[PDB]
Each structure stands twice: as structure tokens, then as C-alpha cells.
């Protein structure tokens, strides 16, 4: 019962994620450097992906920037959960680039942020999302009309709706017996906002730690 428009929107998102990912990824100062290098790569990958999401380029440049400024850490955390290895309790950012809890801590993050990231990753895992579902959830995250500094929130909201609708229809076919899978996925967007909040506290704490974000991350995350 997916419409052709919905099937095509999903295929575009799944293909763009694959393409963007292929393009982008084909003492304690080293660990912080390495970790921020992954972030700068991902920041680019997300910009590249968002440009492929239908409707995104219909917004004004300032709104495109404002949506990406808020979404980027949340999408990074989605992509982190997607790469969670439950067997050894780690995140496989890249073939071999694996991070455990202590590796996050040695990069500069506190336990108050680390543990919720792993709790979120386990919650995500229990949902058993597929490529279509991740990609739809990322599109829905991007078109959040409530982000700071959005000039056309109505337009954003309107661009979100077909993605929400497609997710609703897709999930109703994937698991006709589990009506509640769809709202539990939307609830992961709630958790991501809190995670984003804690992230901003972690960035703040770098200052009276010993550390400075590199320029490309300072732009998006230092306020
Ligand atoms: O906040 C970050 C994140 C994001 C993040 C993501 C996941 C968990 C925790 C944090 C960084 N790096 C990882 C990016 C991974 C991007 C990515 C995803 C998926 C696949 C490949 C690649 C990072 O350097 N900083 C700055 C920072 C701020 C405060 C204290 C220290 C450092």
C-alpha cells in the first residue's frame, strides 16, 4: 500500500545515504584529534546527504544552515547507534575505528553523556530498524520546524510531513502486528534532543578541560 511517490522517496533517501557514505568514508591530544577528525568527516557527509533529501534545497540558505546546525549531532548519534556492536559493547565508526566507553572518556566525554549514548544505542537496537527506517527518521529529524533561527518554520513543517507519513505507511507494512513500533521510533527523536542538550554541556566543559574544538566544529557547536 505504499504509493509510488513514497516508494521513490524512500529509494532516493536509501541511495543517497549509500552514496554519501561511500564518498565520505572510502598524549590524550591524539585521542581528541582522532575523535574530532571523525566528526569533521561526518559533518561533510551530513551536508552532502541533506542536499539529496527532496525539498531541502527548496529552503532558503539560512534555514538550510540552521536545520543542519541543530540536526548534525542528532544524526551523528543516530549513525552511532546504527553502528553499535552489542556483543562487545562498542561503536564501530569505521572498519576497525572502534570506540568503547573508556575510549569516549579518553577523548574528552563524561560518563553522564557516554552512558546515555549506549542506552540509546541499545534502545535503537531493540527496534530493529532497517535502512529505509533510518533514512526516513534522519529526514524527519532534518525538517524540524522548531530549530533555533528558522525563518520559515511553516515551510519546514510542511516538508516534514510526507516523510512522517511515509514512515507511518512503511512501518504499517513491515510489522502489521506491531502498531506501536512507529511511535517508539518517534520517541527516539525525543531522546535525541536530550542527548543534544548533554552534548552542548560537553562542548562547554572542554573550555575548562584543556581543549578547543577545531575550526570546522567550532562553527557548528561553539555558542
Ligand atoms: O561531539 C563530538 C563528536 C560526536 C559524537 C558522536 C558520537 C558519540 C559522541 C559524540 C565527535 N566525534 C565523533 C563523530 C562520529 C561521527 C560518525 C558517526 C557515525 C559513523 C562515522 C562517524 C567529536 O569530536 N565531538 C566533539 C567533542 C565535544 C566534547 C568533548 C570531546 C569532543
Numbering used by the authors: 219 to 244, 263 to 459
Paper text:
The liver X receptors (LXRs) alpha (LXRα, NR1H3) and beta (LXRβ, NR1H2) are members of the nuclear hormone receptor (NHR) superfamily of transcription factors that function as heterodimers with the retinoid X receptor (RXR) and activate or repress gene expression in response to binding of cholesterol derivatives or synthetic ligands. Transcriptional responses of LXRs are known to directly result from ligand-induced conformational changes in the receptor: similarly to other NHRs, in the absence of ligands or in the presence of antagonists, LXRs form complexes with corepressors, while binding of agonist ligands forces the C-terminal helix H12 of the receptor to fold into the active state that creates an activation function-2 (AF-2) coactivator-binding surface. Reaching isoform selectivity by rational structure-based drug design has proven to be difficult since the ligand-binding pockets (LBPs) of LXRα and LXRβ are virtually identical. Since the adverse lipogenic effects are considered to be largely driven by LXRα23,28, drug discovery efforts have focused on developing LXRβ-selective compounds.
We have also included compounds AZ7–9 representing a structurally related series where the central scaffold ring is replaced by a maleimide core. AZ6 and compounds with higher potencies were assigned to the first class of ligands (high ABCA1 inducers, ED50 ≤ 11.3 µmol kg−1), while compounds AZ5, AZ8, AZ9, and LXR-623 with weaker potencies were assigned to the second class (low ABCA1 inducers). Analysis of crystal structures of LXRβ LBD in complex with WAY-254011, AZ3, AZ6, and AZ8, as well as of previously published crystal structures of LXRβ31,40,55 reveals that GW3965 and BMS-852927 are the only compounds not forming a direct hydrogen bond with LXRβ His435 and therefore they do not stabilize the His435–Trp457 activation switch crucial for the agonistic conformation of H12. Other agonists form shorter hydrogen bonds of 2.5–3.1 Å essential for proper position of H12, which correlates with their activities both in LXRβ HDX-MS and functional assays.
